[PDB]
Structure 1
């Protein structure tokens, strides 16, 4: 249809298991596959996370209520370092790198923040909404989309999630939106 028949999911149990798997160009020259910072997606969706940031011994009584469920501690920088089955996410900035707490040797979790005045700021919403989607193998954009609770109301992503069309490589044709899972399969157009 002109946009999408957002009525394209009439059996699993809760068909929210949908994804933003669009198409981009090719690498004939020099371009890359990246995502900004926690792409929220203009839609409340309904996602409560357990966002893991690396603050300190003060950010445990207000740097944990803002679309999350905890924050790594000061004793647990390497005192959570004794297992592979034991242990979004984060890494504060400014002049602070975090290879001493995420480095060598297979998981992605970059976006948390960087504040020199607050742990939960007066106006800072947008983190715990939607995931990332960097480079993969034959393209990019993998993640999540709408749900079994909307209609054409999760097609708020349709005009500001497919509209994330940043400069295409060179010798390509980036443009094709698709989603779905747990019933059939498909997508309309761009």
Structure 2
């Protein structure tokens, strides 16, 4: 088979370190085409408590550039100034017809506090099991719409909630600088511990494992 040698070099008793198993992820996977990395990091959150939700925009400190097509909901001069930041479809309620069709070309929605009457009155159900974000909790809607997507369209990966403990994020292209990604995983620690919701349980992070796509299993540590 091709699913047996994968289960050979996975030792759950030996929790791997930073420099040990992440650099050898190119040999643990026998993938055909060009793939990438994933990152799974847990945070203790009960399912029936609403004061434990951990969300926010994470500015990644490097791999992929402008890759995600993100929309703009602005009025006035910001409808022609946010186009310089890399967005394709910038406008108004003409983009609400694309919401009614259910277009999955967009993944992230960014607006500004003057077109917040558009998403809050038309994109009600389809925007958020759509899960498109528009928060003052996160930095989704500032009034700095010129300088939003100069780095957020490039390297920002959005933190979503789950019913359980899990917060899975995405790693970058396999042939990047692997010394920087191990610090990118180390600087996702300071972002997830930046909010200590102050009602956390016993641990902060129990299990943190970064898999590539479907083959590698790399058990990391929460301390280092």
Distance of 2:165 and 2:23 partners within structure 1 = 27
Please report how far the alpha carbon of residue 186 of structure 1 lies from its aligned counterpart in structure 2 after TM superposition. Answer: 2.6
Distance of 1:84 and 1:26 partners within structure 2 = 31
Of 112, 116, 130 in structure 2, the residue corresponding to residue 107 of structure 1 is 130
Please report how far the alpha carbon of residue 161 of structure 1 lies from its aligned counterpart in structure 2 after TM superposition. Answer: 0.7
Q: CA RMSD in A?
A: 3.2
1:187 aligns with 2:212: no
**Residue matched to 1:120:** 146
What are structure 2's unaligned runs of at least 5 residues?
Answer: 1-15
**Residue matched to 1:178:** 209
Return closer, same or farther for 1:2/1:64 CA change in 2, 3 Å cut-off. same
Return closer, same or farther for 1:91/1:60 CA change in 2, 3 Å cut-off. closer
Distance of 1:29 and 1:136 partners within structure 2 = 12
Contact 2:64 2:172 in 1 (8 A): no
Please report how far the alpha carbon of residue 100 of structure 1 lies from its aligned counterpart in structure 2 after TM superposition. Answer: 1.8
Return closer, same or farther for 1:50/1:30 CA change in 2, 3 Å cut-off. closer
Return closer, same or farther for 1:183/1:154 CA change in 2, 3 Å cut-off. same
Of 170, 178, 181 in structure 2, the residue corresponding to residue 151 of structure 1 is 178
Please report how far the alpha carbon of residue 15 of structure 1 lies from its aligned counterpart in structure 2 after TM superposition. Answer: 3.5
Contact 1:53 1:112 in 2 (8 A): no
Return closer, same or farther for 1:125/1:76 CA change in 2, 3 Å cut-off. same
Please report how far the alpha carbon of residue 29 of structure 1 lies from its aligned counterpart in structure 2 after TM superposition. Answer: 7.0
Please report how far the alpha carbon of residue 19 of structure 1 lies from its aligned counterpart in structure 2 after TM superposition. Answer: 2.2
Distance of 1:84 and 1:30 partners within structure 2 = 29
If each structure's strand is expressed as a fraction of its own residues, which one has the higher value?
A: 2
1:113-153 deviation per Cα after TM superposition (whole angstroms, max 9, x unaligned): 322xx6424x9743121322232121242221233122222
Distance of 2:17 and 2:218 partners within structure 1 = 15
What are structure 1's unaligned runs of at least 5 residues?
Answer: none
1:62 aligns with 2:81: yes
If each structure's helix is expressed as a fraction of its own residues, which one has the higher value?
A: 2
Normalised to the residue count of structure 2, the TM-score between the two structures is 0.66
